[PDB]
Design a binder for these strands. Structure first.
Ligand SMILES: [K+]
Ligand SMILES: [K+]
Ligand SMILES: [K+]
Ligand SMILES: [K+]
Ligand SMILES: [K+]
Ligand SMILES: [K+]
Ligand SMILES: [K+]
Ligand SMILES: [K+]
Ligand SMILES: [K+]
Ligand SMILES: [K+]
Ligand SMILES: [Mg+2]
Ligand SMILES: [Mg+2]
Ligand SMILES: [Mg+2]
Ligand SMILES: [Mg+2]
Ligand SMILES: [Mg+2]
Ligand SMILES: [Mg+2]
Ligand SMILES: [Mg+2]
Ligand SMILES: [Mg+2]
Ligand SMILES: [Mg+2]
Ligand SMILES: [Mg+2]
Ligand SMILES: [Mg+2]
Ligand SMILES: [Mg+2]
Ligand SMILES: [Mg+2]
Ligand SMILES: [Zn+2]
Lengths: 118, 134, 48, 299, 74, 177, 80
RNA sequence: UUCGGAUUGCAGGCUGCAACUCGCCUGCAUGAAGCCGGAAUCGCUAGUAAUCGCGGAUCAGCACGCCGCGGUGAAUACGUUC
RNA sequence: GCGGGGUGGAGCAGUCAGGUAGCUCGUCGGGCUCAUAACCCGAAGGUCGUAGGUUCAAAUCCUGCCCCCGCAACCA
RNA sequence: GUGGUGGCGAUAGCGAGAAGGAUACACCUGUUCCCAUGCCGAACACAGAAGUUAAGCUUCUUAGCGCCGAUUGUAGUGAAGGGUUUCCCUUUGUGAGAGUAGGACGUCGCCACG
RNA sequence: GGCGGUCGCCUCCUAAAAGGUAACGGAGGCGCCCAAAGGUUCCCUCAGAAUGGUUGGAAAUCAUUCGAAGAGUGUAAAGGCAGAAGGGAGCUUGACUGCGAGACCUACAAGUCGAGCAGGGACGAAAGUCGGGCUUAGUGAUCCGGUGGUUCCGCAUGGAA
RNA sequence: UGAUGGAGGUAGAGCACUGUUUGGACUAGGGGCCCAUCUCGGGUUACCGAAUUCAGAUAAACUCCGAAUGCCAUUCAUUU
């Protein structure tokens, strides 16, 4: 007998605490990240209206695919340029409760280079 | 009867307004002695009533004391002027409100129960009435 | 023995800060990087 | 404090001053006790005795003023306490030296075919003059120097403790407590002995690099004591020690229940230890100890 | 012996619900977070709630068992 | 890898049949093994713990974590934070290697060995083994030891019950009484 | 696994010297003897007096007489 | 400790109607205290002390005791205050 | 309520100023003596009233609590 | 449908039971890589897609627990009086807690893949 | 009146659901501590209980399960905090300088909170947080002196005093 | 004065926390007796009983709850 906690639940406990000081507005939307075993997802979210303004993911059929780190960089670029079409420049990065180390960092760095300001 | 320990050595006398909060029905025994006036009951009075009941019952049946002297009270000795802090604790009282069943009995025929509770009532500073459990 | 001390600026020697330390836990002179209002820059400050 | 005269005059003047100070503090305590005793008598009297209660408060004021002008007696500086005991027992032949020759590469041979044999619970003095080989011989026994010729055999019952002349057994970088750290002793045991050597409380966390030569000598001695060896190879032990600590060192060694190989140019220290046999250098001469030591010194 | 007590600290609400206050106005003095700082409201070093802007004070619920003060400019 | 090899090829198909497991993921496996040496003697002398830790490392091959008292106790002369106790957690291959040596080398060297207990289950399918003395492990050298000490070996498994854990451990090799 | 904090640990082969049984494992122990192993490799060889394949409990086969019943001891000494 | 040989396990040998309480001896195993003994105290002046064995009485059996026997074989006595 | 005290069988130190538990008489065992006393030699007898703290470590410092003893507990 | 991400006091929970994986989410397979464990690739991190729905997770059933909870009555009490006045009573307004009828196994959005 | 007690500060009850509110009313604390027990970034979740387990005992360490707080929060109590204010780790010194709209408290003197602005920074990828510590005690006016700094004054003038 | 919106934990009430407390059931453990004593394992007073649970009380310094009033406020209404 041994129970291994759900990693999503453990992450979401950290996410709530990240979100106590990070929240999206119309002029500074939240850049929320969801990371799976296979994929990574990005959403630009306005928490005041509770609506997502732009979105990209490794499932978009426009990302060539490869190492999960370099698909995160591909997602970061794609969400940044989709957000640019809607006039989004400034955002606050919501790391989703993940450590800002690897795939998430690759997505975040790719978003900075493609026009998002954060 | 005395509490083994108390959080505070000294306590307000308090007030006794209204009917008893709880313990207004016979709960364990067949007959109860209900207080019809409110009054402090001392642990000495509780004991006198208890012995008056049990003895007449001739160690027969069961007796429940439904009140406990939770509250302490102090006094000052003769020759002591007013002031200089609250007096030392002197005794223990249960504040009893009208409608509280002070005692219950069971295991004895009604004739003995009615006379048993009569003898106890004469030991208490409160007027009382016999109450049959419902 | 907790005591009150002054932290002097090692550059200009202005006695810039009032603080305190336990001498038993900090036998040596407390050294801190503190802003010197005279030089208007962060400088090494040492107990004098 | 600066006196005119010599060491004895300083001791005479100082001892008298501390005596006269001690008597002053005694009389000030008596007067405080007197007031205190009356204050208590009034304090416990009946509340109906108004005058005594009044006098009690008046004397309480004098008692307070007394206790605030009452000189504190300076705490007399504590002297070292040494209790050196061997864990095991000495043999009739603790150390065997046979036909041992040694020379420092490029220098004349210090001794040739040196052969001696210690007896056990013996005070063995290695006499000589400066630069004659005394410290070389002791280094030879421990193993620092490998003999050019001969053999040095220690009985399996012999545990050896070495006190080097130049205090080369301490880590200057580490603290006092770190130096004395041993696998055989727990923390509170180490602190208790260091307090016996006048290292009190956080004085043991001081770096050895900031201590004086005399305080370092105590740490080395403490290392020797903590070994509980039955053979003590001591090279000028009283060096750097204050005169009071020297007498303590000599007296305690005298009672040591083990063999002592000692070197000392201090005439007082050797007398206290009560040497049995003296080994003269460079002319090897295993001799019974006596005032003939002076004869060898003259010659 | 007894006979001691600290000076009272005048804690509690200092601005009313529906009242217009200037920025920096103290809304609530308290030990601990008996009431939480809401929109446009900050909490001081001793838990005092103060307005960050000019607006109307509203004491609101924070979920099930907590309260909250906010300031809403007009 | 030998014991891991045995587990994947032999143990797994059998346990599925015995307990009628619909999916292979139900098969109990050894999650981790925690060897714990409770050394209260560190109070009297700190080095006894130091020598204990050295031997513990050689037995497992991992530097142990020195556990510390979470609470002060005057009866044991124990202060909160004092380093009493050491543990090692073995996972993956290092776990299987150790379990193999324990089954095939260590246990036979136990003085008058008549098997390991069969009631030593926590009720949840975790078995803990109390080694009375060292020197059963070949790494101890039988001469370095000054104070003979034992250890608590906790085998943690994913079995939901004692019965499955008992079976899993038996087929992996366990001289149950 | 952290570097330079753990004791040296290498794959090794234990041998039961009572029967020569050998198996592959890992250990921190060293020895002055090495042997070749199937699959084309060489590992240090450690000598073990008793293993699970030579221990009386595991094997079940004893090597003594299980003592002598005193009734049997009495009858043997006197032939009754 | 290759000192010491207590204690214990097992196996035997004898005497005896019988050796559990209570015998002596043997083999194997086991291998205790003890590192020369505090205050105090004993014997002995030569073939003695010291040490080494041997025989005998009692006695089925059973002594480290007792009685006797020979072998080897010393040290010291100034002196009579205590 | 104001003080003083709890350490071996008893009486005392050590307590201020933290490190290591003793002294006096007594008790027990053995000596010496015809015997007893005196005397000699050995041994025993307390983790410091008790429970928490402070500290590396307390008999010691801090705090409480229970015991024992001298006072007081009301004045014109 | 599933996966993200929110608002609303748990009427959103908990326990028990049932079903599902196409995708997706997970277990899962590894320590070469960045990075990591006061020991341990368990975790964190990274790389991966053999197996598995067993668990998590989603959907469904259950009120057993937790939560929500009207009405009536009562306690208390503002105001106005009264008596036999430490207490008690009348009138007028207000009105609990308790205990209950009941409600409830959520609702309202946005995005992505189907 | 005396004797005893008290004298400033903090927390509670009294105190009558804003605030305030007396008694020689009922209870406790303070005259500090911390170089991290401060800042920040990241991470973590407790006390107990059951069961199993060498030394090991009611109870020292280990494992699983249960466990919403029954722990902890340096120090009294109250209020608060496990989206931590509790716990660990890296780097740090914001326990910054000049200030300060506006408030609270208040006889006065004082006391309390404070967004925000500038200078120069710490941590962080960034958002951002940081002008000590879960909050509220840990303090003392002026006069007179000490020490450091100073583009101030300097009794005819330059100095000095 | 009315309406509206808020802060605040008192009266009452309750026990969900903390103290105080009654009875019942059951009980680890706790006292003596015998058998067995290496003090090792039992069988009992309807012997004492933790904790648990069932029922029932109690509180200035207890609270899962909680009024009436009072209080603060509103570019509000009416009179003043
Ligand atoms: K009556
Ligand atoms: K016999
Ligand atoms: K003898
Ligand atoms: K015979
Ligand atoms: K993994
Ligand atoms: K599943
Ligand atoms: K529900
Ligand atoms: K930190
Ligand atoms: K309750
Ligand atoms: K109340
Ligand atoms: Mg020399
Ligand atoms: Mg107050
Ligand atoms: Mg502050
Ligand atoms: Mg010998
Ligand atoms: Mg003669
Ligand atoms: Mg002869
Ligand atoms: Mg209701
Ligand atoms: Mg009020
Ligand atoms: Mg109020
Ligand atoms: Mg803190
Ligand atoms: Mg001039
Ligand atoms: Mg002039
Ligand atoms: Mg009430
Ligand atoms: Zn400067």
């Amino acid at each position: 007998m041994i129970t291994k906690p759900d990693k999503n639940k453990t992450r979401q406990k950290r996410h709530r605490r990240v979100r106590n000081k990070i929240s999206g507005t119309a002029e500074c939307p939240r850049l929320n990240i969801f990371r799976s075993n296979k994929n990574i997802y990005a959403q630009v979210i306005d928490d005041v209206a509770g609506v997502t303004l732009a979105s990209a993911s490794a499932l978009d059929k426009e990302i060539s695919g490869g190492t999960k780190t370099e698909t995160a960089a591909a997602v970061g670029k794609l969400v940044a340029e989709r957000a640019a079409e809607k006039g989004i420049k400034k955002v606050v990065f919501d790391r989703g409760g993940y450590l800002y180390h690897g795939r998430v960092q690759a997505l975040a760095e790719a978003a900075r280079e493609n026009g998002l300001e954060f | 009867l005395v509490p083994k320990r108390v959080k505070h050595r000294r306590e307000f006398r308090g007030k006794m307004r209204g009917e008893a909060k709880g313990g207004k029905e016979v709960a364990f025994g067949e007959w109860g002695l209900q207080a019809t006036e409110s009054h402090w009951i001392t642990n000495r009075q509780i004991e006198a009533a208890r012995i008056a009941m049990t003895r007449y019952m001739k160690r027969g049946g069961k007796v429940w004391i439904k009140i406990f002297p939770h509250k302490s009270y102090t006094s000052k000795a003769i020759g002591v002027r007013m002031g200089k802090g609250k007096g030392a604790p002197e005794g223990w009282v249960s504040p009893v409100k009208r409608g509280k069943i002070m005692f219950e009995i069971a295991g004895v025929p009604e004739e003995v129960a009615r006379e048993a509770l009569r003898l106890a009532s004469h030991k208490l500073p409160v007027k009382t009435k016999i109450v049959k459990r419902e | 023995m907790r005591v009150n001390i002054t932290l002097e600026c090692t550059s200009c020697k202005e006695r810039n800060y009032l603080t305190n330390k336990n001498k038993r836990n900090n036998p040596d002179r407390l050294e801190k990087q503190k802003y010197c209002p005279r030089e208007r820059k962060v400088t090494l400050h040492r107990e004098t | 404090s600066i006196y005119e005269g010599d060491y004895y005059t300083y001791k005479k003047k100082y001892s008298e001053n501390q005596l006269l100070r001690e008597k002053m503090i005694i009389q000030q305590e008596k007067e405080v006790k007197e007031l205190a005793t009356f204050v208590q008598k009034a304090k416990q009297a009946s509340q109906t005795n108004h005058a005594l209660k009044r006098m009690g408060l008046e004397r309480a004021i004098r008692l307070d003023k007394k206790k605030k002008n009452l000189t504190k007696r300076d705490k007399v500086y504590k002297r070292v306490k040494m209790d050196i005991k061997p864990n095991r027992e000495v043999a009739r032949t603790p150390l065997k030296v046979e036909n041992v020759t040694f020379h420092y590469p490029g220098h004349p041979i210090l001794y040739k075919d040196l052969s001696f044999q210690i007896s056990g619970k013996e005070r063995f003095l290695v006499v000589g003059e400066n630069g004659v080989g005394k410290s070389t011989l002791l280094k030879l026994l421990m193993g620092i120097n490998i003999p050019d010729k001969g053999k040095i055999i220690f009985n399996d019952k012999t545990d050896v403790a070495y006190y080097s002349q130049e205090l080369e057994q301490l880590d200057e970088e580490k603290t006092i407590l770190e130096n004395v750290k041993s696998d055989e002793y727990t923390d509170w045991k180490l602190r208790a002995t260091l307090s016996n050597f006048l290292f009190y409380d956080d004085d043991v966390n001081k770096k050895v690099n900031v201590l004086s030569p005399g305080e370092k000598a105590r740490i080395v001695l403490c290392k020797v004591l903590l070994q509980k060896a039955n053979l003590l190879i001591l090279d000028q032990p009283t060096n750097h020690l204050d005169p009071e600590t020297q007498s303590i060192i000599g007296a305690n060694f005298n009672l040591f229940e083990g063999t002592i190989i000692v070197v000392s140019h201090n005439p007082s220290f050797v007398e206290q230890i009560g040497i049995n046999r003296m080994l003269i250098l460079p002319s090897g001469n295993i001799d019974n100890y006596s005032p003939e030591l002076l004869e060898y010194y003259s010659n | 012996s007894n006979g001691r007590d600290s000076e009272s600290k005048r804690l509690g609400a200092k601005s009313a619900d529906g009242q217009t206050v200037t920025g920096g106005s103290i809304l609530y003095r308290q030990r601990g977070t008996k009431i939480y700082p809401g929109v446009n409201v900050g909490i001081g070093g001793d838990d005092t709630l103060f307005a960050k802007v000019d607006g109307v004070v509203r004491f609101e619920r924070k979920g099930r068992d907590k309260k909250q003060v906010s300031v809403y400019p007009v | 890898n030998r014991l891991k090899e045995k587990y994947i090829k032999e143990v797994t198909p059998s346990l599925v049949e015995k307990f009628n497991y619909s999916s292979v993921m139900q098969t109990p496996k050894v999650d981790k093994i925690v060897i714990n040496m409770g050394v209260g003697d560190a109070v009297s002398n700190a080095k006894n713990l130091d020598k204990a830790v050295e031997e513990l490392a050689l037995i497992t091959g991992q530097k142990p974590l020195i556990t510390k008292a979470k609470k002060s106790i005057a009866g044991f002369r124990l202060r909160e934070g004092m380093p009493i106790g050491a543990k090692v957690t073995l996972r993956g291959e290092r776990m299987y290697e150790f379990l193999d040596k324990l089954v095939t080398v260590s246990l036979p060297r136990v003085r008058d060995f008549h098997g390991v207990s069969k009631k030593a289950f926590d009720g949840r399918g975790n078995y803990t083994l109390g080694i009375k003395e060292q020197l059963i492990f070949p790494e101890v050298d039988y001469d370095l030891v000054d104070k003979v000490r034992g250890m608590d070996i906790v085998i943690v498994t994913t079995a939901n019950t004692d019965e499955e854990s008992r079976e899993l451990l038996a087929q992996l090799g366990m001289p149950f009484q | 696994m952290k570097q330079d904090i753990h004791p040296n640990y290498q794959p090794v082969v234990f041998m039961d010297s009572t029967t020569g049984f050998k198996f592959l494992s890992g250990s921190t122990k060293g020895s002055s003897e090495t042997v070749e192993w199937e699959d084309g490799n060489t590992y240090p060889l450690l000598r073990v007096e008793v293993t699970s394949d030579s221990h009386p409990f595991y094997t079940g086969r004893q090597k003594f007489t299980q003592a002598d019943g005193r009734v049997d001891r009495f009858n043997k000494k006197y032939g009754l």
